Amino acid sequence: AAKSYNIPELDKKLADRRYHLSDTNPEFTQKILKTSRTIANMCYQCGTCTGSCPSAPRSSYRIRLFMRRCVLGLENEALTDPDLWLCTTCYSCTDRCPRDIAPTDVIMAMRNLAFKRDIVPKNFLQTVQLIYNSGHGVPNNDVNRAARTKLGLPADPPTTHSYPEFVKGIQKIIDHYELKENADRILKG
Amino acid sequence: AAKSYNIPELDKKLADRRYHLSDTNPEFTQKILKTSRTIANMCYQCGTCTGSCPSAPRSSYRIRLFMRRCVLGLENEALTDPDLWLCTTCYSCTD
Amino acid sequence: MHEYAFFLGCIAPNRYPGCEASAIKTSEKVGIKLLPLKGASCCPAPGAFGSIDLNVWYAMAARNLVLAEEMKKDIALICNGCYKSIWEVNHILKHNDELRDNVNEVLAEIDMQFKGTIDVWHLAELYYDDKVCGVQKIKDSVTTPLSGAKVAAHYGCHLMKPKKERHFGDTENPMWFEELIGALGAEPIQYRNKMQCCGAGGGVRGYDIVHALDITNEKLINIQEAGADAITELCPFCQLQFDRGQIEIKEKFGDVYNIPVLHYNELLGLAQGMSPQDLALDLHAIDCTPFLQKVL
Amino acid sequence: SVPVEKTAMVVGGGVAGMQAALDLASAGIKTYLIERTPTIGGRMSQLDKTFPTLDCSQCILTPKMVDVGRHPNIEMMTYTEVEKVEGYIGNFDVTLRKKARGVLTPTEATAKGIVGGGCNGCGDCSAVCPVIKPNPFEMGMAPRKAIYIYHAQVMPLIYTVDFDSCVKCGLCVEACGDKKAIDLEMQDEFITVKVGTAVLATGYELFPIENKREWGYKQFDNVINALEFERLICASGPTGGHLVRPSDGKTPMKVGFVLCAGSRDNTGIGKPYCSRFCCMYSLKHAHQIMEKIPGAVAYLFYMDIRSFGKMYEEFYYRIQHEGAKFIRGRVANVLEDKETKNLHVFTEDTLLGRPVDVEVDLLVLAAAVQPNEGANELRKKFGVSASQDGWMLEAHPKLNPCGTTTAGVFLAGVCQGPKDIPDTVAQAEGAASAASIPIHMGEVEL
Amino acid sequence: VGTAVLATGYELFPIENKREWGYKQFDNVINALEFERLICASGPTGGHLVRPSDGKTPMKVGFVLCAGSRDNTGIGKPYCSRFCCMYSLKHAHQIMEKIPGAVAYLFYMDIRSFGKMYEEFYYRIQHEGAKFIRGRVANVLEDKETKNLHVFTEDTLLGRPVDVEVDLLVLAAAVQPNEGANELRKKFGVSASQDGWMLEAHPKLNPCGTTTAGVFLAGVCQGPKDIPDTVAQAEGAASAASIPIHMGEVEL
Ligand SMILES: Cc1cc2nc3c(=O)[nH]c(=O)nc-3n(C[C@H](O)[C@H](O)[C@H](O)COP(=O)(O)OP(=O)(O)OC[C@H]3O[C@@H](n4cnc5c(N)ncnc54)[C@H](O)[C@@H]3O)c2cc1C
Ligand code: SF4
Ligand code: SF4
Ligand code: SF4
Ligand code: SF4
Ligand code: SF4
Ligand code: SF4
Ligand code: SF4
Ligand code: SF4
């Protein structure tokens, strides 16, 4: 941690672990507050949120550390953390926090910011593809068409699948947020 | 962390991270006290020791975590930690 | 005689149609009229879609709401995740002015607007409530006693949590869904940490599947130790995770679970004399035959 | 401008009220000490020991209690309530409800006309009563008869009777014959007194922790609160001072302490303030379990250990030295095993940064404190405002912590806000001095 | 006289010891009383907190809590000073209000807001933007060019070492009895306590009295206290002293 050496293995092994005041950008923290709609800066690190988490006992995911990073404005540390997509959004932390914080909403805002930096698991992009094409993240197939026919049901449910005219409208919504273009250009090989 | 699976990659990836009271053996902690000749159980985790350490800024070594492990008697976690030989014994924390 | 638009999201019509059919028919024989929405789409799934962009989530859920709005009816649901999306966005847009304005100016591109005139209910909400069909009316509508079956209830997460955003009471030892199973004549059993997430939420079931299965296997261990003959759900996400996950836990790990899991509406159908055939039990990854032989 | 009656009233016979009454009487003012309960002792009479000196609570309090009873300048009206207050600082016409005691004191028996004294305190009546009710002093954990005393060391030992539970069989009447202390048909009495100043010392109760469902206080049988633990650990409690599990009576080897239970909470269920002494009696309880039960280990799930006062930090040092484990993490939730009703406490140890699941045989919640029931009605009777936290409001937050905006009324003790015993006694003495000023001058101007 | 009341108060512990905080050798390191005088409108400047090194307004102020307190090393004090957490919060609020854009960092180790309306004050201080790093300061260096202060400690929450840059550093030093107080309390036959404060007749049920008759204690000389607690103690001592005077006799 003496200085940069330009030897990547040594730069990784001797990374500076000290928090500096240049490591904080407020802009990150008020984007988080203006997107999550929660009083995130009011956390005083009681640890109830982590003690509630079903993901914490089996991984390195710690929601309290993410709250601390949000308070200290440590972008490039929260966003580029693979344990950001282990939150199931079970809302147990939000249900138990003594400060009326919704840490899972902070997680959602962080995930939004991470998507705006091309950091995103590929399942989300595939779901975007599916919803853009058909309006359904979990679409219908021939075998269930046969099953529904055997149930006395119509082959296609009363959805955008039966009525494709609505699908175009859905597409416009995605097209308004440039979401299709980003999903396409990130799904590239 | 549901239970043992006997798939080593999955046992490493789903290791139980929860401290249990079966994870503590006192025998370790009074061997530590009877060898180090110091009042180790009296730590209340102020973090001055880690803030003093020349090894902490450039590695994962945290002397305060080792003190916590000693207090909680977490052998097999302190002993089998590669950041146990990064201490230069500069005695700044003790100072 | 109360009538509701039936939102009918993705998994129930597209993998477990028996849930759809049982919902319509069972709600019909009790005093409720579930009738289709006009081209409803995926409610923007809160995990798999709300993680990458919240504004598209708002816009799509609002479009789903305003379909029923122009339909002049309020929505009934059978999915906890669909409940999260639809009900939460409906609640938010009725109070936040500027978010509603942004949603409306996005929706203006398809000539269709949000104003917030309807309400959203889970079909379980209606099945309990007293003005709508109560628990006694369901108990009366039961033809086959369906007794002699230890049933474990899984509440899910998006229906009742958080307390500060919901209205269902205590999210830590609820008993109401237990009363719903009890009305059918099946005895509900208690198992440790019964309020635990199934692990499929937030997109985790897609992102790192082994982590999600470990959360499901913990739940399944507890449920077997209780001695359950089946698991009951109010969420097709939880349905999918428990059934297919049992298939993938048998594969990935070496844990054998043959516990059938059913949405509550298949249990209502079985209690009300519906056959396994028109409930499409064969589309479940885990065979329901032991449970059916126990109850019939 | 206006004369002042040479009399004072102290409402609440707790340590604050007792100290205020003793101070006023020693100054020479005739004082009324009004107590809701049949005995004066208060909350300090329920404690076993006291932090940080570990002295026995009853032993220090017994001399002070004996003095109030003997003192000639104090009339100690126990088992009475304030019905109405009218007037101002000059003359306060206060009408009091003497609830139906059911048993006569020797003075009252003499006044009635019978030479037989009333209730020497023999206790023969309680030996024959067939009704068994919970005891509020032990608060639901020990049995008591319809005619009873709170405990042995009650200042007025007159054996009150609960007429709402008494079946009027008349067996205690025969048990007390030739003294005629028991009159089963007596009712409330309305008395009017004129006082110059009034001191309010209503005290506190426990916050209802049936809420906060994540800690199964009324759900799981081995989850108790702080005062239940004090009564269980005292040698005069429901058992012989042997801490036992309520579920099966076995001796616990392992108990957790959940600090800040319902405290510093902004969720609207608990309290947003600190109760100022939860940490210290939690430390005291840890010391007591470690001393009494050999090999038992205390776990304190804490957040900002607060040992701020004189000899408080050294008490913390001693407790840590004796082997108490300190996990810095607010308890997330509590489960129990159905077979053995052990309690799984789930939280994070934020230091060491790891999730934690701790087995305990017993779980003790350090609940927040609240104003007593009916304290708001009395506070309105005297025209006193409340604070933002719900406690009685003082005249000035800095330079007048005892006086109120209304003249002639002064506060003392936890009724003004949570405090330790020494702080409570200091406040009581200050309030007594402030009340004595107008009486000693004998005149105030308004 | 008939009775006596001792109210000798307190002074600041000499934080010139405990060398790792450069109180005397670094110019922009001050104590809490100096900070109060510097930020008061009646102080040496017009209430404008300025750096002693060059007179320029600071933008970054650190507060070292527990400075010389809860210390068992024999240099500081082993007790808590009771009010240093609260006036540190007050100082953080004052700097964040008077100087726009200034950030307060409080290096704390057990925030102690126990009194009435104290937790709400702590909530308000955090809401207004004060940063709380849970770690006792390890040491303090200073840059030779710009006399700014490098504060080295660990954020034990977040578990990482930290080096915070501050323009001003304020030490919340411990409190001790005033000089000459021990001689006075010996002159009245009052014994000291094991912390060095004046001893009480009974630690529980007589906080104002003393073993020697007719002598009563009031204020921080009995032990560190807030102003309201000090006033309550003083009024109690006044009442206890007035009782024998009012009666006119002491019964043997
Ligand atoms: C579990 C626990 C442990 C504690 N341990 C310690 C310890 O070790 N050391 C220590 O110093 N402090 C300790 N405390 C704090 C201590 O209990 C208080 O500081 C003290 O009880 C305050 O005295 P008080 O007279 O103001 O309160 P109280 O004793 O509650 O005084 C109120 C009295 O007035 C009566 N009263 C109330 N309302 C009315 C009314 N309307 N009309 C008539 N009478 C009324 C009540 O019946 C009661 O007798 C502990 C507190 C708790 C909860
Ligand atoms: S529960 Fe709330 S206050 Fe506690 S650490 Fe989590 S977010 Fe912070
Ligand atoms: S919402 Fe996410 S962070 Fe909160 S408890 Fe559930 S999984 Fe953990
Ligand atoms: S060992 Fe380290 S963390 Fe513990 S008290 Fe000493 S300096 Fe603080
Ligand atoms: S002796 Fe030096 S290197 Fe070792 S832990 Fe202490 S400060 Fe760090
Ligand atoms: S039996 Fe009579 S004398 Fe004895 S305690 Fe009861 S009332 Fe008093
Ligand atoms: S009359 Fe009442 S108090 Fe007396 S013995 Fe009968 S029940 Fe008990
Ligand atoms: S006194 Fe201690 S336990 Fe009680 S509320 Fe304050 S910090 Fe929490
Ligand atoms: S009052 Fe606060 S800063 Fe002062 S010694 Fe006590 S804990 Fe430390």
Short mmCIF file of C-alpha atoms in Angstrom, two decimals, chain A residues 6-189:
data_model
loop_
_atom_site.label_atom_id
_atom_site.label_comp_id
_atom_site.label_asym_id
_atom_site.label_seq_id
_atom_site.Cartn_x
_atom_site.Cartn_y
_atom_site.Cartn_z
CA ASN A 6 2.07 -1.23 -12.11
CA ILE A 7 2.55 -4.93 -11.29
CA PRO A 8 -1.08 -6.13 -11.23
CA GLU A 9 -0.52 -9.05 -8.85
CA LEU A 10 1.34 -6.79 -6.42
CA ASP A 11 -1.21 -3.99 -6.81
CA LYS A 12 -3.94 -6.48 -5.89
CA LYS A 13 -1.92 -7.97 -3.03
CA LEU A 14 -0.81 -4.57 -1.66
CA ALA A 15 -4.09 -2.72 -2.20
CA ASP A 16 -4.50 0.24 0.14
CA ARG A 17 -7.05 -0.85 2.75
CA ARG A 18 -7.28 2.54 4.50
CA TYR A 19 -10.43 4.59 4.09
CA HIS A 20 -9.57 8.13 3.02
CA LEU A 21 -11.83 11.16 2.82
CA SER A 22 -11.12 11.26 -0.92
CA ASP A 23 -12.85 7.85 -1.09
CA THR A 24 -16.22 9.49 -0.39
CA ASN A 25 -18.38 11.12 -3.05
CA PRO A 26 -21.64 12.56 -1.68
CA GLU A 27 -23.23 12.34 -5.13
CA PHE A 28 -23.50 8.57 -4.72
CA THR A 29 -25.21 8.86 -1.34
CA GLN A 30 -27.88 11.32 -2.38
CA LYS A 31 -28.54 9.35 -5.57
CA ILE A 32 -29.16 6.44 -3.19
CA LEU A 33 -31.47 8.53 -1.01
CA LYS A 34 -33.31 10.05 -3.99
CA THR A 35 -33.88 6.59 -5.52
CA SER A 36 -34.52 4.33 -2.50
CA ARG A 37 -36.89 6.81 -0.75
CA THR A 38 -35.52 5.85 2.67
CA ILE A 39 -33.59 7.55 5.48
CA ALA A 40 -30.38 5.65 4.82
CA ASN A 41 -28.02 8.16 6.45
CA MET A 42 -29.68 7.52 9.83
CA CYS A 43 -28.22 4.03 10.28
CA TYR A 44 -26.20 3.60 13.47
CA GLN A 45 -25.06 0.04 12.73
CA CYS A 46 -26.98 -1.98 15.31
CA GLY A 47 -26.67 -5.14 13.19
CA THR A 48 -30.33 -6.20 13.42
CA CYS A 49 -30.58 -6.17 9.62
CA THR A 50 -27.69 -8.60 9.16
CA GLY A 51 -28.99 -10.75 12.02
CA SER A 52 -32.28 -11.02 10.14
CA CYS A 53 -30.84 -11.91 6.72
CA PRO A 54 -31.35 -15.41 5.27
CA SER A 55 -28.42 -14.83 2.89
CA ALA A 56 -25.86 -13.85 5.55
CA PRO A 57 -25.37 -17.29 7.22
CA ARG A 58 -24.28 -18.98 3.96
CA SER A 59 -22.25 -16.30 2.17
CA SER A 60 -20.22 -13.12 2.69
CA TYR A 61 -23.25 -10.86 2.09
CA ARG A 62 -23.66 -8.29 4.88
CA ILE A 63 -26.46 -5.76 4.46
CA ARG A 64 -25.04 -3.68 7.33
CA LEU A 65 -21.76 -3.24 5.45
CA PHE A 66 -23.73 -2.03 2.43
CA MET A 67 -25.55 0.48 4.63
CA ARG A 68 -22.20 1.66 6.00
CA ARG A 69 -20.84 2.02 2.47
CA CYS A 70 -23.90 4.05 1.50
CA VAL A 71 -23.45 6.35 4.50
CA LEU A 72 -19.74 6.80 3.74
CA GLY A 73 -20.42 7.12 0.00
CA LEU A 74 -18.12 4.28 -1.05
CA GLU A 75 -19.03 3.75 -4.67
CA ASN A 76 -16.81 1.38 -6.69
CA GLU A 77 -16.90 -0.73 -3.52
CA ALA A 78 -20.64 -1.34 -3.09
CA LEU A 79 -21.49 -1.42 -6.81
CA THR A 80 -18.60 -3.70 -7.80
CA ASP A 81 -19.36 -6.25 -5.08
CA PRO A 82 -20.64 -9.67 -6.24
CA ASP A 83 -22.58 -10.01 -2.98
CA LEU A 84 -25.01 -7.35 -4.18
CA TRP A 85 -27.23 -9.84 -6.03
CA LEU A 86 -27.59 -12.28 -3.13
CA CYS A 87 -30.38 -10.22 -1.53
CA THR A 88 -33.72 -12.01 -1.94
CA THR A 89 -35.66 -8.84 -1.01
CA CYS A 90 -37.45 -10.75 1.76
CA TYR A 91 -37.83 -7.40 3.61
CA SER A 92 -36.91 -8.88 7.00
CA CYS A 93 -34.32 -6.17 7.65
CA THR A 94 -36.83 -3.47 6.71
CA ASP A 95 -39.35 -5.19 8.95
CA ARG A 96 -37.03 -5.11 11.98
CA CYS A 97 -34.86 -1.99 11.62
CA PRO A 98 -35.18 0.26 14.71
CA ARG A 99 -34.48 3.41 12.67
CA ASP A 100 -37.27 2.88 10.09
CA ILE A 101 -34.75 2.26 7.35
CA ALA A 102 -35.51 0.03 4.37
CA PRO A 103 -32.06 -1.45 3.65
CA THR A 104 -33.46 -3.61 0.86
CA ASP A 105 -34.59 -0.44 -0.91
CA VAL A 106 -30.99 0.78 -0.61
CA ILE A 107 -30.01 -2.55 -2.19
CA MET A 108 -32.48 -1.93 -5.03
CA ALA A 109 -31.11 1.58 -5.63
CA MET A 110 -27.55 0.23 -5.61
CA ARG A 111 -28.58 -2.43 -8.14
CA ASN A 112 -30.05 0.29 -10.35
CA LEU A 113 -26.80 2.27 -10.17
CA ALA A 114 -24.80 -0.89 -10.88
CA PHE A 115 -26.94 -1.57 -13.95
CA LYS A 116 -26.20 1.96 -15.15
CA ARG A 117 -22.51 0.89 -15.11
CA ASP A 118 -22.91 -2.40 -17.04
CA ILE A 119 -22.58 -4.46 -13.84
CA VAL A 120 -25.52 -6.87 -13.91
CA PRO A 121 -26.12 -10.65 -13.92
CA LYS A 122 -27.20 -12.02 -17.29
CA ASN A 123 -30.49 -13.50 -16.04
CA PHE A 124 -31.90 -9.99 -15.65
CA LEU A 125 -30.99 -9.19 -19.26
CA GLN A 126 -32.57 -12.45 -20.45
CA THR A 127 -35.76 -11.59 -18.55
CA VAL A 128 -35.68 -8.18 -20.24
CA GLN A 129 -35.43 -9.92 -23.61
CA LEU A 130 -38.38 -12.17 -22.78
CA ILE A 131 -40.61 -9.35 -21.51
CA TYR A 132 -39.75 -7.16 -24.50
CA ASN A 133 -40.56 -9.95 -26.96
CA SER A 134 -43.73 -11.30 -25.33
CA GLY A 135 -44.58 -9.19 -22.28
CA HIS A 136 -43.91 -12.23 -19.99
CA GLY A 137 -40.71 -12.93 -17.94
CA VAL A 138 -41.92 -16.53 -17.74
CA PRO A 139 -43.58 -17.27 -21.11
CA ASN A 140 -45.83 -20.09 -22.31
CA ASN A 141 -44.76 -23.11 -24.35
CA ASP A 142 -46.42 -25.84 -26.39
CA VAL A 143 -46.54 -28.45 -23.62
CA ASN A 144 -48.51 -26.15 -21.35
CA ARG A 145 -50.74 -25.17 -24.27
CA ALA A 146 -51.61 -28.87 -24.49
CA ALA A 147 -52.05 -29.05 -20.70
CA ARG A 148 -54.36 -26.02 -20.67
CA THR A 149 -56.38 -27.51 -23.52
CA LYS A 150 -56.72 -30.70 -21.47
CA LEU A 151 -57.86 -28.58 -18.52
CA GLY A 152 -60.68 -27.04 -20.54
CA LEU A 153 -58.78 -23.76 -20.54
CA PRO A 154 -57.96 -21.73 -23.66
CA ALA A 155 -54.54 -22.54 -25.08
CA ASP A 156 -53.28 -19.02 -24.43
CA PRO A 157 -54.27 -17.13 -21.24
CA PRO A 158 -56.08 -13.72 -21.48
CA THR A 159 -52.75 -11.84 -21.59
CA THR A 160 -50.52 -9.90 -24.05
CA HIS A 161 -49.90 -13.41 -25.50
CA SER A 162 -53.58 -13.74 -26.56
CA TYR A 163 -53.75 -9.99 -27.42
CA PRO A 164 -50.34 -9.09 -29.10
CA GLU A 165 -51.44 -5.49 -29.76
CA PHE A 166 -50.62 -4.53 -26.16
CA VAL A 167 -47.08 -5.93 -26.49
CA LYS A 168 -45.96 -3.06 -28.73
CA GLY A 169 -47.09 -0.63 -26.04
CA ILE A 170 -45.03 -2.46 -23.43
CA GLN A 171 -42.05 -2.21 -25.77
CA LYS A 172 -42.45 1.57 -25.93
CA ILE A 173 -42.12 1.70 -22.14
CA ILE A 174 -38.82 -0.18 -22.31
CA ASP A 175 -37.84 1.95 -25.29
CA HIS A 176 -38.43 5.08 -23.22
CA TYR A 177 -35.82 4.00 -20.66
CA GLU A 178 -33.31 2.72 -23.26
CA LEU A 179 -33.45 -0.59 -21.39
CA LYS A 180 -33.57 -2.79 -24.50
CA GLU A 181 -30.49 -1.14 -26.01
CA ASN A 182 -28.46 -1.57 -22.82
CA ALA A 183 -29.55 -5.19 -22.38
CA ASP A 184 -28.61 -5.90 -25.99
CA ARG A 185 -25.19 -4.25 -25.81
CA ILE A 186 -24.35 -5.97 -22.52
CA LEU A 187 -25.54 -9.40 -23.69
CA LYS A 188 -22.89 -9.28 -26.43
CA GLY A 189 -20.36 -12.11 -26.40
#
